[PDB]
Design a protein around this ligand. Structure first.
Ligand code: PNM
Length: 624
């Protein structure tokens, strides 16, 4: 069985050459063109595999159950099962048969047309008919469309009137006259060709993906683009004529939204009469995805940012339903999927504010809002006494002279500061001293009860939140900075709304949900209910007290428990200093809604609190 083992290696190498797409390397392993030998020459075998497998997008040829016996003195027979992936699914349970020849020092394959497909003979052809599948829709929690397939409206003389009509079309549709003449002067433009320019009197209808909210949900939903030849080579089950999700939920849910391509792959005779049907199944359209998003809250949350850098997360904290996931600035997903110029796409990538960033999934330093967690931990382990009054003199403070020139800084010079006063004025010195007295060991014990290091079950690409870089602070300064939300903390707004949901469930952390049909997941006993009933009344005073940092929100006249914060970061690209503004707020009477808004690289005298009056009214009216 020495020459028999060489024949098994020849069959294995022939299949591997077909699997890797190198049809020339597979054809060179066949015998000469003759009777009882190879049916075609090496060059003819190359063109037949390249035409047939290329038309069906065959990829991943895998065989099994190989058996190679011996027939004649110089003829060896082989047989094996095989499976392959085509553009209409996986072809499985294929019985292949053939013979080999070892007329010298090497062993070749007596190639026959039945080695392409099992029942092919002589000059048989292969026909493939496909039916494109309609992409499914993305809807909100009330059925409003967020990503649908609509019918769009896509928008000549001789000499002088032609140039005058171009100037008339550029001024009647807010278009550049230098681009209208550039569209009709492209290399692909032939004399009487309709050159499309932009979508919506006519001087001298097509189907496509449509996003109703547009930029208000561009980071969350995403966009779809034309499928390329490289996309088919990676996944043949795609439609080489349709769309593929490029970012956002259009990409994360691309498999469920695109459906499956339908049609028939059959073998015909020399004349195109069908003989054997290999694959055939009806077209299955893409399923719709229903989100927890509120279409009216998503638009309001985005418009409240006013085009500045920031993000806003609105949830129902008792169930976790993500009502709004806004990010600003944003891009136009309709222009992104229906043709965009090289200048407009470069303007989105070269924009320093980066509109492509999903800021609700980007890890930031939580700021002074994180004092709610440090206080709740201090109340659980008995370190923080709600009535204990610390004496703080001045605006700067340090533990001892070993800190050098670093001092914890506060804004309000209040001499008598207890826990309630610290949350109203956002006193960093108070929380810094209570964190040091708490100790790193007991501080991490309360932090580990949260979602630090956990990857949330959400169709949004993000990194898990962290307490610090390593498992130990190993620095009293870093321990204090982590007390009031600075240091090496990295928590994205979605993870902040999850950690802050304990104050709406009496110490129970409710994980956020984006899909409407998913079951509510929670984590009980994260913080004590006693700490909730102590901090939440103080969070009311952050809005109601006249010296509260969120006193401008008392104008709403609705029950609110809030906590603001303005974290300052080291920018390096700018040595003046960059500060982010944060705001957390929820209804402490019914726990119907919860809001976490931020303002990245804020302007002076600007804050997320100033821009939250509109969204807080809608969430209080429609989510009790
Ligand atoms: C929490 O992050 C605190 N921020 C600082 O100490 C940094 C800072 C604050 C103001 C100006 C420059 C640097 C507190 N959070 C904010 C807030 O809650 O709005 C305060 C201004 C109260 S300090």
């Amino acid at each position: 069985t020495q020459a028999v083992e060489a024949g098994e290696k020849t069959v294995e190498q022939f299949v591997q050459a077909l699997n890797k797409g190198d049809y020339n390397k597979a054809a060179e392993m066949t015998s000469k063109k003759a009777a009882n030998k190879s049916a075609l020459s090496e060059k003819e075998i190359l063109d037949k595999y390249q035409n047939i497998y290329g038309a069906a997008d065959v990829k991943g040829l895998q065989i099994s159950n190989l058996k190679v016996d011996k027939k004649d003195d110089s003829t060896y027979s082989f047989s094996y099962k095989a499976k392959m992936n085509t553009s209409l699914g996986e072809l499985k349970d294929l019985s292949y048969k053939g013979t080999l020849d070892r007329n010298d020092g090497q062993t070749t394959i007596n190639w026959q047309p039945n080695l392409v497909f099992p029942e092919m003979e002589g000059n048989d052809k292969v026909s493939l008919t496909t039916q494109e599948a309609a992409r499914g829709n993305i809807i909100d929690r009330n059925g409003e469309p967020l990503a649908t397939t609509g019918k769009l409206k896509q928008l000549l003389g001789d000499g002088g009137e032609k140039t005058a009509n171009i100037k008339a079309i550029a001024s009647s549709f807010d278009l550049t006259e230098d681009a209208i003449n550039q569209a009709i002067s492209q290399s692909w433009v032939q004399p009487d060709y309709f050159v499309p320019l932009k979508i919506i009197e006519l001087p001298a209808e097509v189907d496509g993906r449509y996003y109703p909210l547009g930029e208000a949900a561009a980071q969350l939903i995403g966009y779809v683009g034309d499928i390329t030849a490289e996309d088919i080579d990676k996944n043949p089950e795609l439609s080489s004529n349709g769309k593929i999700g490029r970012s956002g939920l259009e990409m994360a849910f691309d498999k469920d939204l695109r459906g499956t391509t339908g049609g028939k792959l059959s073998i015909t005779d020399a004349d195109g009469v069908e003989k054997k049907v290999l694959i055939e199944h009806e077209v299955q359209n893409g399923k719709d995805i229903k989100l927890t998003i509120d279409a009216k809250a998503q638009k309001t949350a985005f418009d409240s940012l006013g085009g500045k850098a920031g993000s806003t997360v609105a949830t129902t904290p008792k169930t976790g339903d993500l009502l709004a996931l806004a990010s600003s600035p944003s891009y136009d997903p309709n222009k992104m999927t229906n043709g965009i110029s090289q200048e407009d796409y470069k303007a989105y990538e070269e924009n320093p504010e980066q509109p492509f960033i999903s800021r609700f999934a980007t890890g930031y330093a939580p700021g002074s809002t994180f004092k709610m967690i440090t206080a709740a931990i201090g109340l659980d382990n008995g370190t923080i006494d709600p009535n204990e009054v610390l004496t703080i003199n001045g605006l700067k403070w340090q533990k001892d002279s070993s800190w050098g020139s670093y001092q914890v800084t506060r804004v309000s010079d209040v001499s008598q500061v207890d826990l309630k006063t610290a949350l109203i004025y956002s006193d960093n010195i108070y929380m810094a001293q209570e964190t040091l007295k708490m100790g790193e060991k007991k501080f991490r014990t309360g932090l580990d009860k949260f979602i630090f290091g956990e990857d949330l079950d959400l169709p949004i690409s993000m990194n898990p939140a962290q307490i610090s870089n390593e498992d130990s602070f190993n620095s009293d300064i870093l321990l204090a900075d982590t007390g009031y939300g600075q240091g090496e903390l990295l928590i994205n707004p979605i993870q902040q709304a999850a950690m802050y949901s304990v104050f709406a469930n009496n110490g129970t952390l409710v994980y956020p949900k984006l899909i409407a049909d998913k079951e509510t997941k929670d984590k009980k006993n994260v913080i004590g209910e006693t700490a909730v009933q102590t901090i939440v009344p103080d969070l009311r005073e952050v809005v109601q007290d006249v010296n509260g940092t969120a006193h401008s929100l008392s104008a709403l006249g609705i029950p609110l428990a809030a906590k603001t914060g303005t974290a300052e970061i080291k920018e390096k690209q700018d040595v003046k200093g960059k500060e982010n503004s944060f705001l957390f707020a929820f209804n402490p009477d019914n726990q119907g809604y919860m809001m976490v808004s931020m303002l990245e690289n804020k302007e002076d005298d600007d804050s997320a609190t100033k821009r939250a009056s509109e969204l807080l009214q809608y969430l209080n009216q429609n989510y009790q």
